[PDB]
A paper describes a structure:
In this study we present cryoelectron microscopy (cryo-EM) structures of the ribosome from A. baumannii in complex with the clinically relevant antibiotics amikacin and tigecycline, solved to high resolutions of 2.8 and 2.6 Å, respectively, allowing comparison with previous apo structures of the A. baumannii ribosome (Morgan et al., 2020). The overall structure comprises a large 50S subunit, composed of 23S rRNA, 5S rRNA, and 28 ribosomal proteins, and a small 30S subunit composed of 16S rRNA and 20 ribosomal proteins. These constituent parts form the recognizable structural elements of the ribosome, including the central protuberance, L1 stalk, and L12 stalk of the 50S subunit, and the head, body, platform, shoulder, and spur of the 30S subunit. Therefore, for each structure, the 50S subunit, the body of the 30S subunit, and the head of the 30S subunit were treated as three independent rigid bodies and their reconstructions refined to nominal resolutions of 2.7, 2.9, and 3.0 Å for the amikacin-ribosome complex and 2.5, 2.7, and 3.0 Å for the tigecycline-ribosome complex, respectively.
Hotspots of structural differences were identified around the exit of the polypeptide tunnel on the solvent-exposed face of the 50S subunit, specifically in proteins uL22, uL23, uL24, and bL32, and in the 23S rRNA helices H6, H7, and H9. For example, the 23S rRNA helix H6, situated near uL23 at the edge of the polypeptide tunnel exit, takes up a different fold in A. baumannii compared with E. coli, S. aureus, and T. thermophilus. Clusters of differences were also identified around the periphery of the subunit interface, specifically in the 23S rRNA helices H58 and H63, the 16S rRNA helices h8 and h44, and protein uL14. However, the strain of A. baumannii used in their study (AB0057) is reported to be susceptible to aminoglycosides amikacin and tobramycin (Adams et al., 2008), and in our structure, H69 forms contacts with h44 as seen in other bacterial ribosomes, suggesting a more complex and subtle relationship between the conformation of H69 and aminoglycoside resistance. Nearby, A1902 (A1913) of the 23S rRNA H69 moves toward the tRNA binding site, and the phosphate of A1490 (A1493) moves in toward to center of h44, away from the decoding center. To investigate the possibility of tigecycline binding to this secondary site in other bacteria, the structure of this site in the A. baumannii ribosome-amikacin model was compared with that in ribosome structures from E. coli, S. aureus, and T. thermophilus, so that the site is compared in its empty state.
Numbering used by the authors:
A (entry chain A): 2 to 273
B (entry chain Z): 1 to 44
The structure:
RNA sequence: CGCAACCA
RNA sequence: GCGGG
RNA sequence: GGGUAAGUUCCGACCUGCACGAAUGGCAUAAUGAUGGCGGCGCUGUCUCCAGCAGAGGCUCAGUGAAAUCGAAAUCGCUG
RNA sequence: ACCAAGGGUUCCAGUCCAACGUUAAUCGGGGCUGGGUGAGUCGACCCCUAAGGCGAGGCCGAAAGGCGUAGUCGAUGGGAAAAUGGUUAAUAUUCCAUUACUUCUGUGUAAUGCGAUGAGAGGACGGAGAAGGCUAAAUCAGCCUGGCGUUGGUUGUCCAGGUGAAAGGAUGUAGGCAUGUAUCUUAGGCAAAUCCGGGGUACUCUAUGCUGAGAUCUGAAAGUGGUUGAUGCCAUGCUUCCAGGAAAAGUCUCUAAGCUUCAGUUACACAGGAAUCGUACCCGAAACCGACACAGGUGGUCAGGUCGAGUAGACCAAGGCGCUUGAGAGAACUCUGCUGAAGGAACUAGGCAAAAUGGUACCGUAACUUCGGGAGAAGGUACGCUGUUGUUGGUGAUUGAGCUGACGACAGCCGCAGAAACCAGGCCGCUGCAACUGUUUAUUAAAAACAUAGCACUCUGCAAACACGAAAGUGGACGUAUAGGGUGUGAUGCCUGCCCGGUGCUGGAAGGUUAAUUGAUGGGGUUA
C-alpha cells in the first residue's frame, strides 16, 4: 500500500511511497533487456524540441511482448518485476515449450497463474482475445488499433476500457478519457485491468526526486523578458495578456485537433 | 585566473586541420584564398 | 442599426 | 451598395 | 499603551484603508536563512583621548631606471 | 617524489660575458663547440566497441546541398606477458648480472573428426553500510660492530650505527557461490545440433563442484620475537534500498555447408622469431595557459616520526630550499602587529572593525511544536605530576607467561595559572518576508528575485497534441489519458466571497452580409 516517512529531515516530511511485497528482488531476465541511452530532448539537428528533459538514472529497456502471437500454447507466470520505463509492472511468462517472454501484468496476477492467447482462450485475466470473442461489458486493456500492430490503448498503470458492444463489423468501447470510440472486431485485447493502480497516490516530497526521473525545472513565462516569452516584461508582477505558449498558442480552452482522417471512428467526444 | 586558450593538439587538428578544411566547400575556398595570397603555411 | 466598399 | 426599423 | 533620563525607528492596540483582500491567492505557522528592523548579557582602543613598543616602507649612500602631462615662461599678496 | 596534457633540447661537458637576467656576475634555462634518449614484457600502433562523425545504393532539395541503410571510423572504456641489484657527466622494468614469463612460426612423434557471416553461455558492470581474516608499514626487544665523552657523572637498568631480499614456481587454508547425478523425452532457440531451454522418473543434501586472501616450502659480522596496524588483498564478495544500475571482440559449447585419410584439431621434443614509433628534460612550474624568470590557474598518484579522532595542528624525517638589488639610519606619515590606567557603545547610518566564546566527561535545560525538534538551548562542576590499591578488553609462550587498550577510587606534591603552547561554538528576547536543501547578474546587486515538493485549469485517442526542419525526416516515445504538452500558484493549517456587461474561448444555426468562379441581360465600335 502506501507508507509515510518520519519527518527527520525537511526533505523527508512529505515522502509517500507505494510499496508492494510480491515484486521480484533481483536482476531482470538478460536475454530480454537492451540498452537505452538518454536524449536530453534533442533531435536530428541537435536542437531542443522538448523542454524540461535531462538527466536521471541510467535505465535499460525491457523488450515487452505487445502483440501476443503465440496462440494455443499456454504459459505460467514466473514472477512480477519492476519496470523503469513504464508505470505498470511486468510479468515474466514461461511458455510450455520453454520460451520466455515479458507482458504487461494484470491486476490480480501473481506467480503461478496460467495465461493463453488466440480466439480459443478461456476468459481469464491475462488472456488475449479478438474483440469478436469477448462478452459484452468486459473490462479490457492492451487494445489494438491496427490489425497485427500490437497494443496501443490502455497500457498505463491502472487503465482499462469497457466493451460497450459490437455492431456491424465494429466494436464500440469507452476509453479512460471518457471518449467513445469504435474499433475493428479483428483487433485484440486482454481481459482485466492494468497492475499497479496505486501509482497516483505517491508523493515525491522533494525537488531532487523529480530530477532522479529526468525532469528539468520549468521557468514561468511571466518571469522572463519580452524577448523570450509573450508573457515577459513589466515592473513588478503583472500578466496583462491572455495566456499563451512560448510560441503564441492559446493555453486555456483553445482546441488543437486537426485530423480529418479519423473523425469517423470517434463516436462521442469526451466533453459531450 | 583560467584563460581562454587551453591547448589540445587533437582538437586543434580535428577543428582546423587540412582534412577538415578539405572535407567541405567553404574550407576548400579558404585553401584557395590562402594559396592565392602566398601563405607559407596553409593550415595550423 | 449590422455586413461589405475610393489610391484627387 | 446590400438588408433594416 | 510598553520600553529609555530622553525613542521620526521597534513592539501592542485603535480604524479616519489618499490608494488591503482571498491561487498576479488571504490570514497564520514548528524548523531553516553569510535575509530586513528593534532590544539585552558578556566583551572590548569603536569612543572620552590617545601612549609605548615590534616588523615593512619613508629618509641617506652605491647600482639600474619608468609614468600621465606639457603654446612658451624672467610662474608673489590685496583691492578693482 | 612521480605520471597525463602542453612545451620542444631547456638535458650533460668544455669554453665566452657584448646583449638577455629588474644590481654585479667569474654564474645561468644566455652565446659558441661537442655529446646524449638502447624494450617480445612500459606506452603508442594493433583487435573491439560508446556518444558522435562519414556514409555505396536510397529518400529529399532552384543549384550549392540535407538526411539516412549496409558499412567504416571514433576512447575517456574491454583485449598476452619481468622482478631484484649494479653501472653513465648525462639512458635505463630498455644496458649488464641473476632468476622468469607470454605468444607465434618451422621440423618432427603419437592420436582422430575438424569445421560459421548461424544459435547459446560468458565478458556484464548501481548507491550506501558494515563485520571478519590477512598483508604492507611503523615501533620496541634481542643480536653484531664501534664508543667511554673539552664541564659534575657515565663498564652500564649506558650511547650510536646496522640488522627483516622481489617477481616467479609447488602445495592448497580461512572466506564466498550453486543441491548435484545417470536415463527417457522434447508446440522453443532465422535451418541443424550430441549443445542451451522445457518437461518424466529414480538416486542424493557432514554430497557434489566452482572460486579464492594469507601462511609454509622453493627462488636464497649479525640477520631473530612481540605490539600496533591500513585508504591495500579476500572483495567484479556479503547485507540493504529504490531512483533499478554500457556495448562489442578476445574466450567457451554446438552443429550447418566443406573436404574427407589429406587437411584441420591437441599432447610433446627439437630449432628459431616478436616488426615499427615514443623514451632526454620541465609538473601547485623560471620550461605548460596568463605580453614578463608574473604572489593567479592546471587532471591523477605516493606521502614517515611525537602527540592527535584526523590527510586538522605545532615541531621534525627522507628530500629540497633561503624566493637575482644591497648597506645604513631608526623623523612626520602609511601599512601589518602586540600591550595599555579609570570608564565600557558615550563611537557610528549601523557594535563596522576588534575584543570575546572555544576540548573531553558528567550534571542540568524554557516557551512553542508539524512531536522529529527547538537543544551544544540557557547554566554548572572536574581535569597537572607522584605513590599505593582495584575492576575489566585484546593477543597469546610453557590453564595461562610477556606486550598492550578503557575505567575507578584513595593518599601526597608543586605553581598566578594544569584544556597548559598550536588547535578550538559568543549567547538570549520581540518582530516583517520567503516553508525548507538548492540557483542567479564571469568583473559594484546572493536577495524578499528564480526553482521546488504539493495544488488547479486546459489541450492531446496515437501517423497524438507540441517542437525542429525547405523537404526527406527527427525529438515527444521504442511512451499511450495514473501518459504526454502548455499556463498559473507555491510545504503545511484554516480557507478561497460576488459579477459573463467588455475582450478571449467553447457550443449553436434559422436569417442578413460577403471572394474567386459563372455570365442573363443591356449599351457602344467597325461594314455588306
Ligand atoms: Mg513541462
Ligand atoms: Mg527579470
Ligand atoms: Mg530588467
Ligand atoms: Mg513578442
Ligand atoms: Mg505594480
Ligand atoms: Mg538607536
Ligand atoms: Mg495585492
Ligand atoms: Mg485572482
Ligand atoms: Mg540556503
Ligand atoms: Mg639611488
Ligand atoms: Mg643546465
Ligand atoms: Mg648584468
Ligand atoms: Mg645554454
Ligand atoms: Mg605499428
Ligand atoms: Mg550521414
Ligand atoms: Mg550518393
Ligand atoms: Mg574502428
Ligand atoms: Mg584508453
Ligand atoms: Mg635524469
Ligand atoms: Mg557499490
Ligand atoms: Mg668529566
Ligand atoms: Mg608480476
Ligand atoms: Mg625520464
Ligand atoms: Mg624572481
Ligand atoms: Mg608562477
Ligand atoms: Mg582599556
Ligand atoms: Mg583595566
Ligand atoms: Mg549612540
Ligand atoms: Mg554622537
Ligand atoms: Mg564583526
Ligand atoms: Mg579576533
Ligand atoms: Mg528562501
Ligand atoms: Mg555563480
Ligand atoms: Mg557581480
Ligand atoms: Mg557579490
Ligand atoms: Mg509567486
Ligand atoms: Mg500556502
Ligand atoms: Mg476568486
Amino acid at each position: 500500500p502506501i507508507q509515510k516517512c518520519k519527518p527527520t529531515s525537511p526533505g523527508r516530511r512529505f515522502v509517500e511511497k507505494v510499496v508492494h511485497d510480491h515484486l521480484h528482488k533481483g536482476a531482470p531476465y538478460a536475454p530480454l533487456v537492451e540498452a537505452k541511452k538518454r536524449t536530453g530532448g534533442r533531435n536530428n539537428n541537435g536542437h531542443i524540441t522538448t523542454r524540461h528533459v535531462g538527466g536521471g538514472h541510467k535505465q535499460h529497456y525491457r523488450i515487452v511482448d505487445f502483440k501476443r502471437n503465440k496462440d494455443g500454447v499456454p504459459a505460467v507466470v514466473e514472477r512480477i518485476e519492476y519496470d523503469p520505463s513504464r508505470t505498470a509492472h511486468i510479468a515474466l511468462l514461461k511458455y510450455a515449450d520453454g520460451e520466455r517472454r515479458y507482458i504487461i501484468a494484470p491486476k490480480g496476477l501473481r506467480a503461478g497463474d496460467k495465461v493463453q492467447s488466440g480466439n480459443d482462450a478461456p476468459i481469464r485475466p491475462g488472456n488475449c482475445l479478438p474483440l469478436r470473442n469477448m462478452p459484452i461489458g468486459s473490462t479490457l486493456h492492451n487494445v489494438e488499433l491496427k490489425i497485427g500492430k500490437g497494443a496501443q490503448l490502455a497500457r498505463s498503470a491502472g487503465a482499462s476500457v469497457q466493451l460497450l458492444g459490437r455492431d456491424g463489423s465494429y466494436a464500440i468501447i469507452r476509453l479512460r478519457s471518457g471518449e467513445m470510440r469504435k474499433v475493428h472486431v479483428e483487433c485484440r485485447a486482454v481481459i482485466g485491468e492494468v497492475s499497479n493502480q496505486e501509482n497516483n497516490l505517491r508523493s515525491l516530497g522533494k525537488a531532487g526526486a523529480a530530477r532522479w526521473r529526468g525532469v528539468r525545472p520549468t521557468v514561468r513565462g511571466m518571469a522572463m523578458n519580452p524577448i523570450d516569452h509573450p508573457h515577459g516584461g513589466g515592473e513588478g508582477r503583472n500578466k496583462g495578456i491572455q495566456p499563451v505558449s512560448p510560441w503564441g498558442q492559446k493555453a486555456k480552452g483553445y482546441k488543437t485537433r486537426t485530423n480529418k482522417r479519423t473523425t469517423k471512428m470517434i463516436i462521442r467526444d469526451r466533453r459531450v | 585566473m583560467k584563460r581562454t586558450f587551453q591547448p589540445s593538439e587533437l582538437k586543434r587538428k580535428r577543428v582546423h586541420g587540412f582534412r577538415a578544411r578539405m572535407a567541405t566547400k567553404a574550407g576548400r575556398q579558404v585553401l584557395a584564398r590562402r594559396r592565392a595570397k602566398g601563405r607559407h603555411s596553409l593550415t595550423v
